[PDB]
Amino acid sequence: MNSVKELNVKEMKQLHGGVNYGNGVSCSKTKCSVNWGQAFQERYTAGINSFVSGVASGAGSIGR
């Protein structure tokens, strides 16, 4: 797929760079606290959402 909209996402993806287990952060220029609770429930909602369609609300996975 030589798409520009599809390649646009992949590009920016490995463009900004990448992380490798950045759980050991410290206080520098900004607060040294993480929201692994509130947004924890956030990813849970966004995750199941994509899962639904992929299967149900999507009907375009062709994965038997």
Torsional class of 18: left (φ above 0), alpha (ψ -120 to 50), beta (otherwise): beta
- DSSP state, residue 57: T
User: How many distinct structural domains can be found in the chain?
Assistant: 1
3-state secondary structure of 5: helix
Domain span at 53: 1-64
Residue whose token pair is 């199941």:
48
Secondary structure (DSSP) of 9-54: HHHHHTTS---S-TTS---SSS-----TTHHHHHHHHHHHHHHHHH
